Symmetry: D2
Subunit: 501 residues, 4 copies
């Protein structure tokens, strides 16, 4: 079984050894990171099934993100397998503040009346919490009495009971027991804060990521096609046109403008953590099925994320609901499933990846019986798409071990992946950027190979590479597609059914 559903694993201190000290150990942050040992841990995750690593710029500074990115490069060499590099931005969001005098939280216990400051560039006291609003907007006039301020994915709730004009402070009452922690999302539902289409912090973080070398950018809180277009401009201006942009849909505006966002973007990341707070929690499942169907229909990449194996942050086994959620996401038709704290911050990062790989592999087996996606309803809008439909027909007609595509830019691979064929898809490409770029497409196994010359037999190369990759053996039937001949073909125009020597 080759795992068709791709895994995005968020990296962080959990797999990072510093000075021989593990995450949570006293004096850990004071130490310098141990690159080779940290690299070996990451390589296990690669071998376990991680197809792309996510670097959340919401937390670590550029030195932290850059060193972690460098470590993944050694991990690829240790593993002998390449992975995608994905950058997740802060976005038009609100996040929290530090405490005075050595405090890191207050036993925020239910029923008390306390305060949240709107004054920007400051820090907190037990009776008054400061919002490090991204950039430095003043939201005092945007929030009315009766609004709710939620801290840490909604773990703790604050009701605005009054507004103090003298200090520009909200007087709030704790609705339940919880923890106030730095760089924590703060959600204030039903609130129209006018944040910028692209904040300078995001612009700078993206440029830093582009200099390091990344393949994908996940843009937090995309509200319109404009949020995508601004990032696209930076990628094109810097000569990084190959970078794919995944819009993060996490609010009503992103949902209202979904069709326009899908058209501008290369894919969607269903950011359920913020979405379930910004919109009614009971509507997220409805939106998730609908987003997956729409993104697939557009031949784009969809990632399901947040709380998928949440319990695995503290325990070696996930809950029944967590396994069900990962299984259903695959059935709904997701290209990829994602791990956040489970891989970044948890006690069982490798176990979380292996557990997700096992469920994803089991669920792929039931796509024929229970799968929601319907390739039969699609309009075939181009000759390459007609070929992708034909390949899917071959995989339905007989037992096909592998579909091989010789693709220059990955277009043929994306269309074949879009059709969800009953076969793994080996994408033979001629450059590292195209190869890494296909890593989140459902069922695609990207493989680097020499660009073919006019005198080469591309069918022979496809069989040779598939055999080298260990994906096929003598007697197996494979479907191979290419644009023949090289140098005259305008597009993928040929389908061959071949029995492996």
């Amino acid at each position: 079984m080759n795992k068709r559903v791709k895994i995005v694993a968020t990296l962080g201190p959990a797999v990072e050894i510093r000075g021989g000290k593990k995450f949570g150990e006293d004096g850990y942050w004071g130490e310098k990171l141990d690159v080779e040992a940290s690299a070996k841990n990451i390589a296990k995750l690669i071998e376990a099934g991680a197809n792309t690593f996510r670097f959340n710029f919401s937390h670590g500074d550029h030195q932290e993100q850059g060193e972690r990115m460098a470590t993944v490069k050694l991990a690829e060499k240790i593993a002998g397998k390449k992975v995608g590099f994905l950058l997740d931005t802060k976005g038009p969001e609100i996040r929290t503040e530090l405490f005075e005098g050595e405090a890191k939280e207050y036993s925020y216990k239910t029923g008390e009346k306390i305060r949240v400051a709107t004054k920007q560039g400051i820090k907190s006291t037990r009776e008054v919490i400061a919002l490090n609003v991204a950039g430095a907007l003043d939201i005092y006039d945007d929030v009315e009495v009766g609004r709710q301020v939620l801290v840490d994915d909604g773990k703790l709730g604050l009701r605005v009971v009054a507004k103090d004009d003298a200090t520009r402070e909200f007087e709030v009452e704790v609705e339940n027991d919880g923890i106030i922690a730095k760089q924590k999302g703060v959600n204030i539902p039903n609130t129209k804060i006018p944040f910028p289409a692209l904040a300078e912090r995001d612009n700078d973080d993206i440029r830093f990521g582009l200099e390091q070398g990344i393949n994908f950018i996940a843009i937090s809180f995309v509200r319109t096609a404009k949020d995508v277009n601004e990032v696209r401009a930076i990628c094109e201006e810097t000569g990084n046109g190959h970078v794919q942009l995944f819009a993060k849909i996490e609010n009503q505006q992103g949902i209202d403008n979904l069709d326009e966002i899908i058209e501008a973007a290369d894919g969607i990341m269903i950011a359920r953590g913020d979405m379930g707070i910004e919109v009614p929690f009971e509507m997220v499942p409805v939106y998730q099925k609908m987003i997956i169907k729409k993104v697939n229909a557009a031949g784009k990449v969809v990632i399901t994320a947040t709380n998928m194996l949440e319990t695995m942050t503290e325990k070696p086994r996930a809950t029944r609901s967590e396994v069900s959620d990962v299984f259903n996401a695959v059935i709904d038709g997701t290209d990829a499933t994602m791990l956040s704290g489970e891989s970044a911050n948890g006690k069982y990062p490798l176990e979380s990846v292996t557990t997700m790989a096992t469920i994803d592999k089991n669920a792929q087996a039931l796509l024929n019986e229970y799968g929601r996606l319907d390739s039969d309803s699609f309009e075939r809008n181009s000759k390459t798409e007609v070929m992708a439909s034909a390949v899917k027909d071959a995989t339905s007609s007989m037992d096909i071990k592998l579909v091989v595509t010789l693709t220059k830019t990955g277009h043929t691979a994306r269309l074949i992946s879009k059709y969800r064929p009953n076969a793994d898809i080996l994408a033979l490409t001629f450059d590292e950027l195209t190869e890494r770029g296909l890593m989140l497409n459902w069922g695609v196994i990207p493989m680097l190979t020499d660009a073919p010359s006019s005198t080469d037999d591309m069918f022979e190369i496809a069989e040779r590479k598939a055999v080298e990759a260990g994906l096929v053996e003598s007697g197996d039937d494979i479907v191979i597609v290419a644009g023949v001949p090289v140098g005259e073909a305008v597009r993928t125009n040929t389908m061959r059914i071949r029995t492996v020597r």
Copy 2:
């Protein structure tokens, strides 16, 4: 519009000029046939849409059949188009006898009591009719009182009211007004006459046809797989293995043994004239839909025949029921529609072919909306069949002007035809026997071409031949299939989508 449904046209005196005298003219039979003029008439029928000519050995002697066959050869040269040659046998049947003293019929008017002789090798009187039973069986003991003797496709009915042992004669009463004519089918329903699996007259007629050069044999009254196998043995023994055998299903036994007959045969001819008398007339439509579905499922050829444009024997326009029957046969999924008396014996032979071509062409347009055949339900049982399914998918995905196959034996063409693609199928073949052999397959346009060498580009040849044939123009999209490379491919393994220069 290229006519996908093939037409089988029975030849006869109607298009044959003898001594400058037309059929029906006094002294016509006494004259010698005019080959070139007769050839020009046949060429018009070829141009009108006849894809195969049927020679009924039930009527004319070997000199008549042989000269007619020779005339069709000149017609192909005049027309510039080749047609199939089909031989129809007498079979385990009963046919009628000559009258004494210059009489050719008696105004057989209803209610009289008269006689039918069983004595073989004799001739008739108004009060006593002789049965020229094929070969010379004695059926006197096979027919009981109360049985019905029907003459000329059931046009006239005789009820057996008594049996005279002294003369071995049946005493019958005329049930209705009609004509007793020579070499007329005589049906005696619910009668178990034990005729031979292969009569000597049939064996001799088939050998004569094989010496002349034929592509198909329609075997009258096939009751079991054995009837087909006996003919198959003669074809193989004489070096005529290329000949295809169409079983004629015209009785309950043929219907009971249909699955075995289909397996032994290359196709079925639904001989409705005898079938509608041998079995309840109201069941023929049920059998017709079922036979077409079964033969198509087997990738074999099905021909619907008898009374299709019957009125056109005497009038220039068919009845509403005749047009409906031809239209429905195409909708049911027939490969071919047939003309008997309309082309052989009628006053409007060319008009009958043109009328059938018009209805068949109109009906092909409604196959997507009303067509009974369902390719989706078929098991794809071989790699060439998987390719045929893939070609059908391409024709459904986008507008394909033509499907081209380079086929050595016609196997790929038959499987593509089986799938009923929304396109004409140009079958490029390397010998005349394969070319003529594909003439009754739905949508197949056979074309002769040089056998390809290892250095040829078969895709270029396919486009060149299609353009030469006038079937495609610049900008048209075509699907081309072949076994590449020539000399190493085991079978059709390649599908190419090409835009015509």
Copy 3:
């Protein structure tokens, strides 16, 4: 088996005995009608399955039509079975005139030269054929040289070769051997004769028919809804609002206006004879399938007509194409099939009804497997229609012997019939007009009963009537619908599943 598909039989001299003489015997016309002997012949057609008799006013005169209708009333008493009475109007048509002297017809040969008069109010001679043009129009200026004049369903073709202005006569050449009989329909394709809105002759014929007592009117050549509305006004004005109007679609204008025509009418008669000459003959099958689907969707009645068993006019058995046509019309979804010359003019009127009943009964058995109609796609537009859908669901769920509806106006029966349930429909109604009115609805067995009182058990009456009818026996399962209770119910609101005691 009960025959679900209804039969319309055209009456004429064929079933009539004159002074102990049959049609086709010398001096037949000079003898008075043997009413009782003629009535006995008609009762046999009723017993054989004719559900309605058609009186073609294009033929003969009011006395002949009135006498024939009285004979049918006698035949209903002799058979103990009621039938519908249908009047077929002349419409905006051209008919050949009576001939001077004794002649009823003349035979013509290909190439003969004759004339066609345009002068109205005169009789034909063999050499000069006169026309009865609706509205007494002069068509001389409407017909150019080169136009074709066709006689009797296009059986005989006449070519206009010259025009004589002195006599306003067309000089024509006979194109094929044929007959020109008195009162035969004349078609002049590609001409635009300006026929009137409603000819006075049609107003007279309709008023005469309503006075005799009829249940249906088939309006010839309906061009627009106004043609239906004019007839509707006469039916309403005379207190004959119960009469149902079947628009005859026989020209391009009717096809073009089909939706408005269906909306105005109670049903459609597919008048294939004129339609096949008025429009390309190959399109009639396309139009037939489409009309049947549209009329059924509208919950109205569709009759397929002309040439269904044409050969049975002269012979005891129909052709294979004729049997195919009747079977396919049932499969297409027709409520009724019709006989014209076969029952009015032929040698086998009773046999023709019996043969059609046999084919129709066999075809009904294949509706589940091959039926074109799809009740699943219908919008249920009213509470009675929702009950009709529920009744069909019951018939699909289990073996239902009979559906019984207690209907004051037949609306519930029409809706149940629209749904094509897998059961016979016993329509218990309280007046003879409603009873005769349902005779052409698919599967409906109309039965007269006393109107139920508010103290009656309608479920018990339904079982008793079905049992007395011999339709069901002990242990049979039946579905019964009614509006309960009587006097409070505004519509059929109840469905009962009952086992026969």
Copy 4:
């Protein structure tokens, strides 16, 4: 919106007030139960949508269970709403023992070494954990070194590293940080402990529960139909034949024997907590979808259980995966969803019921678009089932506000519920046992009414009861089913479509 998907809420100390003290407050257990205050808390859960309360006999003792059941009877009076009573048996299971002294639990760290006693009838200490094995079995010889002992739904893992024959103790190493609380389920995968047919403890617990008055029994670890039959015998013997048995499928033996188990039982509880440890965790989603389809096909009840809103035990909002799990269970076709620790042990019992009701209500709205269940494939095996199919057809055909069934035993309501109609189902029944008995059927609103006499208008009563319920208003369309007339009817035989006055 009425919540069609039923909720089972496990009761416990969480909703209980002891001497004016809440769960999670010092000295709570040393205070007498405040019955009235506890009853008021429970009434809120009833108001929020709990349809049945679950009493887990694996926990506490008969006095605690009996007192809790009495409090629920009080809560039913306070809410003016009735709920079902469900008893959950211990079954052939292993549970941790009570601890010596005050301790209810102990915390353990990874790598700690402790022992597990096999001796029965003793209490645990922190260093030596004792087990209550069903049937008081000695499992020492059944467990080898290297086996894993899991505690509390597999939350804590223990590895057997040595066996001490002197004390019959297992030496184990703690594999992950976790807690060992009293009376927690213990799983030892890949072992075959020979549990008895029905433990005497289960016989006692069931008899005690039946005496209190219960409507349902969930049988833990059903291995075969015999497990169901033994409980059934006790219910029947005691005159409690009305009690429904839900087999809990939580091991491979139950999965293997599912068809026989479903046949013996009234329903199935998908006990995912034990099932996820007993079988590969990735297979639970496959088994869940399959069990729901099979139970629904059988016209029986299916409950999905465990970890549905697990995070709500400690927090006010559930995770994204938890919400996905509840939504998917409804989409899969579950009759009911369940709360365990969330309602019995957590800080947010009322909120947990409210959150589940909200998700269940939203999910019901997407059943038309995404529902897995397909009533179209069912065989209608009886006349009442045919009526149920017809009712669903009515709800599909038009906007039906409510379906009302007058059912003596609830059979008609079960059949209507099986069909998943697009409407609420008001079940009018004549006894409280039938009424409580229908509380877990999908979409059924059970309502007590007087048994109708033969002079009563059942249709009028149905409308009046629906109106008094506030379920319908003037102009609403309702479908009513009944067996009419009362005293002659052997089953529901009538369907009425009625508009509310």
